[PDB]
Structure 1
Amino acid sequence: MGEELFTGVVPILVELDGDVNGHKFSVSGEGEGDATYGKLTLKFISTTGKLPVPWPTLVTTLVQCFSRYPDHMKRHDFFKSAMPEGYVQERTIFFKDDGNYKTRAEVKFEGDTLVNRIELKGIDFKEDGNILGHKLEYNYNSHNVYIMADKQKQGIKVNFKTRHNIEDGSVQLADHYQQNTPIGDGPVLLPDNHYLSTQSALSKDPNEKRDHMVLLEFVTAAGITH
């Protein structure tokens, strides 16, 4: 029942190891979250092999505990309730007519810092597809993220679509299937069905020569009146 841990500005650290079709890479990220305002500011850096996939395809993988839950919805905030011990967040992300990512992450406090440690495995991608061919625009669409309880696992099931603009004007759909389960064995908040209204803006740091992504994201829970 850790929502009190989020009332201020919280430092965030992200660490990802990835392998997509045998192309290995790592990403570090830093920034801060202000859940009262649903606000995230993050900067990610590619640190090992040449990044084999477009940055926008990594946004969802690279801390939904920073969502703003309206007061009347606070009994539905699983993410903060699992803190500080944290939660495991797992996904399969199906890129339409292309490969899939499978991700496993642990999101938890290490002292004052909220840490997201991730392993990503991608298989079945096309060599010349939109992902491995780097054909996606550096931008990001707004949409809803749908949440339901998974009582049997004392957690939540989450599903949503992202629609990544392709450089030719078309769109590359990514269907996300997600599960979150507590790391600890104490009680958590199991929600009624609702969603997170999630908007994201991507940019570059003009002074950064490493391959990187700056992300500004605002997220608000919605769908339940009362």
Structure 2
Amino acid sequence: LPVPWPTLVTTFVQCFSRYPDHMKRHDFFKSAMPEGYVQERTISFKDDGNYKTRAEVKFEGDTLVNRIELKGIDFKEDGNILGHKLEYNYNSHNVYITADKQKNGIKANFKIRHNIEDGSVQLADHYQQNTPIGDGPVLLPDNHYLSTQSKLSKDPNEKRDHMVLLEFVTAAGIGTGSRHHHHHHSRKGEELFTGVVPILVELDGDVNGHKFSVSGEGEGDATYGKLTLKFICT
């Protein structure tokens, strides 16, 4: 793998976030299902290169799949990314979501703080836009945030280069007086997430001409804002 695993966490399914009852009317991600959404990002590593990503997230039968292309350029050979100088861990923080009326979707920007091995912080500035694939109605949200927590681990019986990921995501930032206390909204999309959903993730990448692929498997339980994924280089 040509880059540190933590640098890919954000790229490797926000439809698995927990939206409590009063906020379900703001859940763009599930509302776009099963047709899905396109997710695009620029990720700018301070003093280093950038990733640009395009993904389609949708249902194929009973499976939520996230297929990604990533292009990374302008990285330093001996910088924190290509030189693998980032600790294997991950900071919890809040991702703020706003509607993007023009693309019938959402945007977000947020900064990830990556610990550097024997140094300070490598910042990764994220710009994100999401657009529905289908033409059906979607839920465009009021401003809110996703409180996102991520634990990184290893499988002691896995010989391949890999990452195990446990994530918990809960929406917040809207109070119960919002929209005159009205919870009502269409449950289309949302109803597909009431139980445990299998996930496939597949990525093709090229970072400074180093080409690689990753596959990931696991499951999501949105009732608990819970995701479990294991990723391997392929």
**TM-score tier after normalising by the smaller chain length:** 0.7 to 0.9
Partner of 1:43: none
Give the AA of the match of 1:216.
L
The answer to whether the aligner puts 1:129 opposite 2:102 as a matched pair is no
The answer to whether the aligner puts 1:146 opposite 2:75 as a matched pair is no
Q: Deviations over 1:84-126 (max 9, x none)?
A: 0000000000001100000000000001100000000000111
User: How many percent identity over aligned positions?
Assistant: 95
Among 127, 135, 157, the residue aligned to 2:107: 157
C-alpha RMSD of matched pairs (Å): 0.5
Partner of 2:144: 194
Using the alignment, how far apart are the partners of 2:145 and 2:74 within structure 1? 30
Using the alignment, how far apart are the partners of 2:107 and 2:128 within structure 1? 6
Partner of 1:221: 171
Aligned residues: 176
Post-superposition shift, 1:185?
Answer: 0.7
Q: Deviations over 1:121-150 (max 9, x none)?
A: 000111110000000000000001110000
Using the alignment, how far apart are the partners of 2:41 and 2:134 within structure 1? 20
Matches within 5 A, 1:84-103: 84-103=34-53
Q: Deviations over 1:173-207 (max 9, x none)?
A: 00100000000011100000111000000000000
Q: Secondary structure at the match of 1:73?
A: helix
Partner of 1:107: 57
Partner of 1:80: 30
Partner of 1:69: 19
Using the alignment, how far apart are the partners of 1:185 and 1:69 within structure 2? 23
Partner of 1:168: 118
Using the alignment, how far apart are the partners of 1:87 and 1:145 within structure 2? 18
Among 112, 115, 129, the residue aligned to 1:179: 129
Using the alignment, how far apart are the partners of 1:75 and 1:150 within structure 2? 16
Post-superposition shift, 1:161?
Answer: 0.9
Unmatched runs of 5 consecutive residues or more in structure 2: 177-234
Using the alignment, how far apart are the partners of 1:99 and 1:89 within structure 2? 20
Among 146, 153, 164, the residue aligned to 1:203: 153
Q: Secondary structure at the match of 2:102?
A: helix
Unmatched runs of 5 consecutive residues or more in structure 1: 1-50
The normalised TM-score by structure 1 is 0.77
Using the alignment, how far apart are the partners of 2:14 and 2:86 within structure 1? 24
The normalised TM-score by structure 2 is 0.75
